[PDB]
Amino acid sequence: DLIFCRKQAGVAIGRLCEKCDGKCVICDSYVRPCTLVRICDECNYGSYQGRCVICGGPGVSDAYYCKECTIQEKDRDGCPKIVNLGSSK
Amino acid sequence: LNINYNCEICGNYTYRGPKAFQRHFAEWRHAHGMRCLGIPNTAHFANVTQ
Amino acid sequence: QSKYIGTGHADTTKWEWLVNQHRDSYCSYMGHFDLLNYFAIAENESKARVRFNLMEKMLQPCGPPA
Amino acid sequence: CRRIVPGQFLAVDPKGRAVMISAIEKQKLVYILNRDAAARLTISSPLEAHKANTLVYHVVGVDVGFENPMFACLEMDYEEADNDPTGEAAANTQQTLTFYELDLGLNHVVR
Amino acid sequence: TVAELKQLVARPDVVEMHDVTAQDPKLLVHLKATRNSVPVPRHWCFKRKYLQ
Amino acid sequence: RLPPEVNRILYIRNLPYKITAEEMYDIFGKYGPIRQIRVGNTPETRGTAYVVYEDIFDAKNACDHLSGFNVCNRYLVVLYYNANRAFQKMDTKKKEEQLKLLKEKYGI
Amino acid sequence: DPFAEHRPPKIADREDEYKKHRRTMIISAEKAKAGELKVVNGAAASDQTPGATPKKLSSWDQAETPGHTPSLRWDETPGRAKGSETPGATPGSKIWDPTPSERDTPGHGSGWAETPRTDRGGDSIGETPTERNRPLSDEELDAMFPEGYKVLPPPAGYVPIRTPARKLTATPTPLGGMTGFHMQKSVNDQPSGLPFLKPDDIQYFDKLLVDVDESEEQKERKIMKLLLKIKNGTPPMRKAALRQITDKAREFGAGPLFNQILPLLMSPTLEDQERHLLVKVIDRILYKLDDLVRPYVHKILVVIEPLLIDEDYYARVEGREIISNLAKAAGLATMISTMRPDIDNMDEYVRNTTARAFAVVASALGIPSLLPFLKAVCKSKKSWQARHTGIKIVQQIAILMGCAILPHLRSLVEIIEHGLVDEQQKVRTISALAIAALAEAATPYGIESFDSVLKPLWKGIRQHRGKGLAAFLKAIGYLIPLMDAEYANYYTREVMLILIREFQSPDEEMKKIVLKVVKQCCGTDGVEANYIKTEILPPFFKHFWQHRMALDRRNYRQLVDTTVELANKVGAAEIISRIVDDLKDEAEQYRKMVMETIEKIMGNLGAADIDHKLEEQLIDGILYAFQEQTTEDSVMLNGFGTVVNALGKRVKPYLPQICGTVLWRLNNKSAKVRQQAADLISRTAVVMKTCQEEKLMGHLGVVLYEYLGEEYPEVLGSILGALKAIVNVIGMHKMTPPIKDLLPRLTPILKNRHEKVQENCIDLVGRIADRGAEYVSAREWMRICFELLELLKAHKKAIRRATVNTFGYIAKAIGPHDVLATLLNNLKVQERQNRVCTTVAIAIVAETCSPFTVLPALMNEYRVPELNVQNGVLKSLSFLFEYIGEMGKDYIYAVTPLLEDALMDRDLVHRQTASAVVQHMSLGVYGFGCEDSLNHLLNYVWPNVFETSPHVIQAVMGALEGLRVAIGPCRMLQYCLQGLFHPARKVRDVYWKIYNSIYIGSQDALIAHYPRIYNDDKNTYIRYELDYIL
RNA sequence: UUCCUUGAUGAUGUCAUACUUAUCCUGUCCCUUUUUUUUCC
């Protein structure tokens, strides 16, 4: 019901809301932000301009990835823009 | 246990369990059949039947 | 996982697994400049004829399936 | 060095517009380029050529001055070659020349 | 024959009962022997689910 | 001036298993002409019955007064029957003949 | 009725008259041309169906490429029997002349239905030249009732009175009667039963009025009333019952199920919740059954599709979710062969929805799968109603698939053009409308794909009256952004006229449209400033800005937007100048509107443009509004804040009037409005500072300080907030309530239970115990500690969040041992308490002085026999290493033996959490050379591999992944060889899952580590290269 | 040469109790807006 879109990784900076704000996206964690989020404008467009990469609210900041997911190199897979397995709106 | 089985090298003997037959591999008589047969003992020949 | 090639599953045949690691051996050999040059030296050819040959042997290696 | 991840072969247009990049197998991506407001080089977002089980021997920029650009992926399929128990498809396959065609306006890339 | 499947292996002892159950003994043999690798652990076929 | 859900059918329950079509037809007979009736004769549906009239407003007057009405020592559950559901045991059809008929006599 | 009062605030209907047909729904190669004469002939035999024939021939244009799949898709559409016959015959004639150079039943039932409506409607057409009450036949009656009922006769005298009933219903309606009671060992308790049955529901669950066993199918139905435990009862019942049905999926099979749901998902009286849940069952079982659902698919959508048309958003998104899950779940050709006949169904509703269905199934199976079908539809020549639909379909595809439409854009359009010219209107209308939606997803691109569309459009624009007209605008407008401002230049210059003449219409569909247009037309770079200033504005502000508009929702927004963009161009003072005067217009929603508009504008453009006099009118305004607030709403508040922070030191003359109101309001007016003014301070802090109005800072500091005794939460919250932001401007040692006073004054508040308090408080306490932190003697702190500790009952995340971070700040102030000793107090006997956030304290603490201190305390504390606190300490290590990283290169040794113990069983949980420790350690250390030990641990890890317990497993996957990077593959792979081919399934399942995870990363490394493998007869598995020796 | 009590599983049961995910407990309303074309200097 809730899983990744994993469409291709564009240049568009990620956008996170109030709620999600601290979280390294995949490791769920606040620890050690280092590097930066990219998603496809397909995932990120329009009403999604500055939209949460989780909940559907306006982005007030920019998710940083952990270092943990870094050395395991996951940040480079398909764009982590979570789709509810209904549509994305 | 109590399941029909047979060892061929020993007197075409019958064994009622697989744990027991797996214990036959280390035994006096089984090694006597091997060594007196000219097939030397211990651990390479464990899986023998015929 | 599936659309990422080289994925296995428990039904994986001997043959397929080995052909995989062949191919990957190759894209390494095309990759690592030196390793390549090594081959070239040993069996005397061009760099090229090497890479070419390899890219022939890509689909084949081991020969036909079973 | 992967089997599937680009960077191996690299090609780019005369007019510099866009640049195509490719692994050996399965992936060919394309980054488009245009100089910024101040004519400093800004990079597009990527695209994808994906085609399954296809070997790319070699890729080369193409010439069309101010068109939708072209590229030459020298290819071969091995998929015939697997599902031939015999070893006939081992022979009697020919490597397939294909020109891919960027298309700006539509912004995808079509065989 | 789990018999004559046993004369092809340097350490044929590594063949075990469920082994010729193997889909690919002709291989599994040649692997499981391999230089430094580690045996698969023993707890399954013991149905007691690892600790008591 | 009516709720849409109610229909010419009523589900009717809290019946005895002796009970008579004579009683039934009479009692229900008040409000209007009976389209017809069914009685559950089966291991489960022994005890219940369906009732259907030539008009709804018939039935409306029914569920109105017969609400919780008594028979024997029992109180009858009196409900507007649902619909749709499991019927399609009977396939839609039987047009062709008939609609040719209206096609014919009246010519229309 | 009062029960009809408190029961109606349970649930509620929500629906229109229009949507209530729902109740009515009863359940479930020039010889390629002359060839088309052939195909048409043969199928026409096997009458008249159009878009079938077109889905057939629609495989032409890929020529040479059409295959077996033709038999698939067509196989469903016609009866798969005739299928082979035809498509076989075709493939023959095609290969050759290539050289020499129930469904059917269903539609039959439709053409039936409308033939009938023709008969009746005509009968009152000549009868007018001369419904549910329609009389019935016994053939029909048997079908409606389920199985298992006798019809009766009581008597032909009985049924004669019945026959007499009507005639004697009027007759004996007027006759004698009245009824007389008489004043004067019972039994028979009726069983009405098992959580509970509403009265109405008896009809469904009636068979739970019988009490028996020994009946077999009927035992499956009679066991499927597990539903009722879904529909009604307690939450836990719902849960457990729910799974019990999930695993019983395969077993009972769909047929019985949906037979037993769809009545309920059709229930005239259904709730919200009950609906939503019964959806949940439909999804969940639809994660399982795949091939199964086929005969049921239409028999599903009929319920679901109405979900698409719902006021509730979350409703919709569920709906879409399951219509995919079905459509993908079933087969494509299933979906199609299913869903034609709803296209021409008389009701526009069912079409409409039917589209949105096809939208979804298309998101599932991709456009190009489905195209030749559509493209067939829009060329259906039987009737338009289809085409109206098929086009709609294009649209809702547009909306859903959105930004991704891009590639087949050209094809889609190549459908839809042939509409615009049509004789029928709607088809024009809807068509164009689609083009719009397309472009709105095509942003910005594919311009020339739309290309051949225009030249009609522009012409069409001229000649129109009506809804269609403005529609064509809706398009063009969304085009213009896509053109070249030279070509776009021209064409723009034409439109802005018609736009002008059309501001004025009464139509609201209109005003939305023309509005959004202006956003785009004059929303352009290649349009000239003055020109807008003259022609447009004065109308614009005239007809639009009116009270009609803002009361409505959308128009409100769309408006704000538009006006904003006219600012982004013609400047600021222009707009704002004209709408200032309306802050003082009375009615709220209006004011709210002007207010937010301005807020944005001075958001984007900047204050710097604004003159002076106008400005007086601002602040006078923005107070006058702010002084009267129906609710407390973020709008006016933010809108203000931005106003000030934009004006900067232009603001300064105005304070006294502000802070004057700020206080005055602040008091009285009774408390509801208080929190507002409080916030107002919150946001304007910064402005009170840099300008250096300190008397102001005396005022605020102290007078806020008094309220902190206010008892209402919703004031005190905002109060503190103000305090916090007050602190962020004026430093500690200049604080006018100098901290010594303050910080304790806070301290007792922490009980406050209510939310907003706990938030702003712990926030505050945090800032201050971070920054100053010396001001307050230690003793006070340790009181703070022992008060914090139970803030960890917070339902909320954020509280605990900052809570922890504070716990750290003070832990710095004092020094560690105690504060963990104090944290160490949480125990295994309870659990919920010290669940983990406490552990997170142990972590952060353990950093903020050298952890190199703290361990021995911790480690030793794993001795304690109380189980759950044991595992607690394990996680402590977990977060601990996650937070330390490199430093682990030391204490690793310390833990390693402990990890050995915990990792060896007591219970799972030990192994789970501990293993996690292995993870974060294994990353952190990376490549400093401490592997050896980590190898050692790998052992005691390893056996854990096997289990079903989801947390244990995804834990372990965690472990071995990290361990890979630490140890390197080669070692790993040396645990994973033997596993691959192990005869059993169980092992192979896993060792494969591992070897994958090893495999994806570091695939490049491996090559070395595949061992030598002896080549067999047909093949060579030895890679000879590596042995070339110079 | 003439002799004791016992262990254990697996399957089916809506009993019982601990526990796991920085899960969850607040976000959230926005293109459902659908009709036989029909708004007059």
Curated annotation (Swiss-Prot), chain A:
Belongs to the PHF5 family. Residues 29-45 are annotated as: Interaction with SF3B1 and SF3B3. The chain holds residues 7 to 95 of 110 of the full protein. The record marks V11 as: Interaction with SF3B3. Its main location: nucleus. Zn(2+) 2 binds at C17, C20, C52, C55. It is found in: Nucleus; Nucleus speckle. It comes from the Eukaryota. One of its GO terms (cellular component) is U2-type precatalytic spliceosome. Keywords: Acetylation, Activator, DNA-binding, Metal-binding, mRNA processing, mRNA splicing, Nucleus, Phosphoprotein, RNA-binding, Spliceosome, Transcription, Transcription regulation, Zinc. Zn(2+) 1 binds at C5, C40, C43, C79. One of its GO terms (molecular function) is RNA binding. Residues 73-76 are annotated as: Interaction with SF3B3. Zn(2+) 3 binds at C24, C27, C66, C69. One of its GO terms (biological process) is stem cell differentiation. Component of the 17S U2 SnRNP complex of the spliceosome, a large ribonucleoprotein complex that removes introns from transcribed pre-mRNAs. The 17S U2 SnRNP complex (1) directly participates in early spliceosome assembly and (2) mediates recognition of the intron branch site during pre-mRNA splicing by promoting the selection of the pre-mRNA branch-site adenosine, the nucleophile for the first step of splicing. This is PHD finger-like domain-containing protein 5A. The lineage of its organism: Eukaryota, Metazoa, Chordata, Craniata, Vertebrata. The modification Phosphoserine is found at S88.
Swiss-Prot record, chain C:
Keywords: Acetylation, mRNA processing, mRNA splicing, Nucleus, Phosphoprotein, RNA-binding, Spliceosome. The keyword Metal-binding does not apply. The modification N6-acetyllysine is found at K3. Residues 1-62 are annotated as: Interaction with SF3B1 and SF3B3. The record marks G6 as: Interaction with RNA. GO terms for biological process: mRNA splicing, via spliceosome; positive regulation of DNA-templated transcription; regulation of DNA repair; regulation of RNA splicing; U2-type prespliceosome assembly. It comes from the Eukaryota. Its main location: nucleus. One of its GO terms (cellular component) is U2 snRNP. GO terms for molecular function: RNA binding; splicing factor binding. It is found in: Nucleus. Component of the 17S U2 SnRNP complex of the spliceosome, a large ribonucleoprotein complex that removes introns from transcribed pre-mRNAs. The 17S U2 SnRNP complex (1) directly participates in early spliceosome assembly and (2) mediates recognition of the intron branch site during pre-mRNA splicing by promoting the selection of the pre-mRNA branch-site adenosine, the nucleophile for the first step of splicing. Belongs to the SF3B5 family. This is Splicing factor 3B subunit 5. It comes from Homo sapiens. The chain holds residues 15 to 80 of 86 of the full protein.
Swiss-Prot record, chain D:
This is Splicing factor 3B subunit 3. It is found in: Nucleus. The core of the protein consists of three beta-propeller domains. Component of the 17S U2 SnRNP complex of the spliceosome, a large ribonucleoprotein complex that removes introns from transcribed pre-mRNAs. The 17S U2 SnRNP complex (1) directly participates in early spliceosome assembly and (2) mediates recognition of the intron branch site during pre-mRNA splicing by promoting the selection of the pre-mRNA branch-site adenosine, the nucleophile for the first step of splicing. Residues 34-57 are annotated as: Interaction with PHF5A, SF3B1 and SF3B5. Component of the 17S U2 SnRNP complex, a ribonucleoprotein complex that contains small nuclear RNA (snRNA) U2 and a number of specific proteins. Part of the SF3B subcomplex of the 17S U2 SnRNP complex. SF3B associates with the splicing subcomplex SF3A and a 12S RNA unit to form the U2 small nuclear ribonucleoproteins complex (U2 snRNP). Within the SF3B subcomplex, interacts directly with SF3B1 (via HEAT domain), SF3B5 and PHF5A. Identified in the spliceosome A complex; remains associated with the spliceosome throughout the splicing process. Component of the spliceosome B complex. The gene is SF3B3. Residues 82-111 are annotated as: Interaction with SF3B1 and SF3B5. It comes from Homo sapiens. The modification Phosphoserine is found at S45. Belongs to the RSE1 family. Transmembrane segments: none annotated.
UniProtKB/Swiss-Prot annotation, chain E:
Changing R48K: Abolishes interaction with SMN1; Abolishes methylation by PRMT9. Abolishes formation of omega-N monomethylarginine and formation of symmetrical dimethylarginine. Methylation at Arg-48 by PRMT9 is required for the interaction with SMN1. Changing K49R: Moderately diminished formation of omega-N monomethylarginine but greatly reduced formation of symmetrical dimethylarginine. Abolishes formation of omega-N monomethylarginine and formation of symmetrical dimethylarginine. It is found in: Nucleus; Nucleus speckle. Transmembrane segments: none annotated. It comes from the Eukaryota. The modification Symmetric dimethylarginine is found at R48. Changing K49A: Moderately diminished formation of omega-N monomethylarginine but greatly reduced formation of symmetrical dimethylarginine. Component of the 17S U2 SnRNP complex of the spliceosome, a large ribonucleoprotein complex that removes introns from transcribed pre-mRNAs. The 17S U2 SnRNP complex (1) directly participates in early spliceosome assembly and (2) mediates recognition of the intron branch site during pre-mRNA splicing by promoting the selection of the pre-mRNA branch-site adenosine, the nucleophile for the first step of splicing. This is Splicing factor 3B subunit 2.
